[PDB]
Q: What sequence folds into this?
């Protein structure tokens, strides 16, 4: 009984415009990692 | 024969001990190079 | 080392031994100044080099006093190396 | 491991086991050269790998001498691994 399946939610944004410090690269996609 | 205790620093390196000592004091009293 | 003796001796293993001479010369030599040079783990480092130095040459007539352990060898150091061994090997 | 056995065996858990084979092969294998390679914590590292190696296979007839502890297993190492275990596991 002490092997409970912990389940919670991850979240991540794709394609955000970073505002300028006063930006020619624009993200179309975002990368993540597997469990492998 | 009776066994006398002689002085030696004994470190235990794993399963068998060894008796580390130095004779630099024996060579310095006679002013001899070690 | 038994690992390079148990294969007998070939002409291929001789190059491994001549390279292992240099690899043991550059790293393990002057081990006490390296143990003062490095960070933590100096006690295991000094105890490791001394234990390999015992294992290189591998009733009892010379026992310890408060036990019965045969004393199985003797290190002969200088007076400057004796205390730097006795501090890294505290007990 | 009881954690992947207590769920029975499915076809989904087989991919987890085949990936866990590689994850245990790349990290935990040749643990003694890694324990010499790393910084501090080598005693807990070696004791951890040996304790997992005992727990993998999990009156008494073989007790210790000055106590009564049953000796519950036996490691058979080489002569080069015996002293590198006995230095990292000092007591």
A:
């Amino acid at each position: 009984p002490l092997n409970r399946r912990m389940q919670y939610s991850y979240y991540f944004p794709v394609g955000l415009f970073m505002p300028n410090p006063k930006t020619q690269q624009l993200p179309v996609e975002a990368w993540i990692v597997n469990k492998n | 024969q009776p066994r006398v205790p002689i002085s030696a620093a004994v470190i235990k390196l794993g399963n068998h001990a060894v008796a580390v000592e130095s004779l630099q004091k024996m060579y310095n009293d006679t002013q001899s190079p070690y | 080392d038994p690992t390079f003796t148990e294969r007998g001796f070939s002409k291929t293993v001789k190059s491994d031994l001549i390279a292992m001479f240099k690899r043991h010369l550059l790293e393990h030599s002057f081990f006490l100044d390296r143990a003062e040079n490095m960070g933590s783990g100096f006690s295991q480092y000094v105890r490791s080099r001394l234990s390999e130095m015992v294992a290189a040459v591998s009733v009892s007539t010379y026992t310890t006093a408060k036990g019965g352990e045969p004393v199985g060898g003797v290190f002969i150091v200088t007076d400057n190396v004796l205390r730097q061994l006795l501090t890294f090997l505290g007990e």
Summary: Residues 24-28 of chain B form the longest helix (5 residues).
